[PDB]
Symmetry: D2
């Protein structure tokens, strides 16, 4: 719970800083971007892995509840992920959160920055360096963020647990300058 998260260059992640959250896994597409999960709703937005190979993803900024790391972002700690964008087609926030009414638990936008529903934790994934997985604790239980088939491709969804990395969607943080 004390090992600071690092970007693709091995440097410590910092808040108020832009990063591309890119799949560490299957290198046959691009980064994570907003997109609707299905044709039932266009808002709020889900999180997909773009199929276009050199599209980096839409940048995010990592926020922190209590000044206890100055600007640093530590592992197994409460953080909030917010897409950074000059344009937003939905009347809700860009902060990540979970769709509880979704009977599939898609990771969606619209979450509240300071609220606890938008809380996620970054854990080390497997053994690759600077590689991680995301995990949320809805009501005490720990579940890792995975992915599932959606309209536009694989969309981030909450798994039933965090017992093993097997179902986790591995990610890396690439600094945007």
């Amino acid at each position: 719970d004390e090992e600071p998260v690092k970007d693709t260059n091995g440097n410590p992640l910092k808040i108020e800083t832009r990063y591309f959250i890119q799949p560490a896994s299957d290198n046959n597409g691009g980064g994570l971007v907003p997109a609707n999960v299905d044709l039932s709703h266009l808002c709020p937005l889900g999180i997909v892995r773009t199929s276009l190979p050199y599209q980096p993803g839409l940048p995010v900024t990592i926020s922190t509840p209590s000044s206890s790391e100055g600007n640093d972002v530590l592992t197994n700690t409460n953080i909030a992920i917010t897409f950074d964008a000059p344009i937003w087609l939905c009347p809700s926030s860009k902060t990540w959160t979970v769709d509880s009414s979704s009977e599939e638990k898609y990771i969606i936008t619209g979450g509240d920055p300071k609220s606890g529903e938008s809380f996620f934790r970054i854990e080390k994934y497997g053994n690759g360096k600077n590689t991680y997985k995301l995990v949320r604790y809805d009501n005490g239980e720990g579940k890792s963020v995975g992915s599932t088939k959606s309209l536009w491709g694989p969309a981030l969804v909450l798994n039933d647990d965090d017992d093993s990395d097997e179902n986790a969607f591995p990610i890396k943080f690439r600094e945007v300058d």
Copy 2:
């Protein structure tokens, strides 16, 4: 006062909780009024636009009467609420018309509370044409009528800061 029954294209009095297409008075170009984005900055909520396809009737609405319980006739000059009727909705808000108070155009949009003063309009006779009306809203004192402006897909209803004449066509 003055409060007479609003009538549909067949001259029949309007009934609450009944589907009607709201269509522009003159059957010139386009079809009925439908939900559509007004610009490229937002998908939701939705504006009210006249479709340019000539045989599209428009998306039906139901009318509810806020301040009244007096039979099932909709009357002119009486607060009423307008709600689109559809089996599906792509936005995370209601199908009720209201005013986009915070837009320099005062677009009429979806997502209002059918029981809040925000979503109340009054139907008044328009010009000569029989069974022709206009929608009017009161910020409270003085009333402004619903007109239109050009938007992404076509004319979009806006609160006039002439009115956009409409008629009601019973569904089926």
Copy 3:
């Protein structure tokens, strides 16, 4: 070769706007242009709208033969073309079978004068003014689940009204 009839029992005339509407148990409305998948926006497929009161997009009918008056008779090569004041794709509003793909989607952009877009309208079941499309005449037009909903597709080597998409024509005015 008896006349195809609309919902009023009137025979269809060529170059007259008609709504093609699903002659079956009714969840949705008429046939309209829509994209079949996320791989292409153009050309367009034929999809049944899920909205209750959407008539469908209008279509006109044309005949390769020019000696049967203006009557659109059953079992006679005809060309179905969407009628609209605007079109967002480079090709034609005429229906045709996507020669190549799996489900042989019926698509837009055909040549009303080419035999590539000729269809046949024939009686469907022992009903009233209910038909189907076939393609001299042998493959029946059925449907299959697509992006927006049922999309028209040509069926394999069969015409029996078991896997055919039931339709009625409603005159527009």
Copy 4:
């Protein structure tokens, strides 16, 4: 002419090589991408400067009609530009050409890289290193590629002249590793 076109790293451009064609005028946006120019047609596609800050643009590969200078690309020489993508929503080709039928003379996709109607010329552009501009040839006169306001943003159009860089949309080429 004989001089080589250089990418952002000052290296010579090569054929069959993916590059991002990025605007050199501002930092108020991202690279060049396919987008429809107006609501009248979805296909073919125009070339628009995306407003999203970190979108690099959709890669393009450069081709030479002639089988002369191997895989080299030199200024003042005839070349065709073609988008590179595993997905394409329009029937037509990914090759750039001029829409001679529009009053705006929008640069659109669907051209024939082998036909002279898709050929363009990369020439130097005023201030800054490795900065260029594109010019097309009517017959005897050159017309630089500029841009005009379109539905989704600045769209490339064929200018009137090439008397100055004044109305030319400057670009640079960034190799897509």
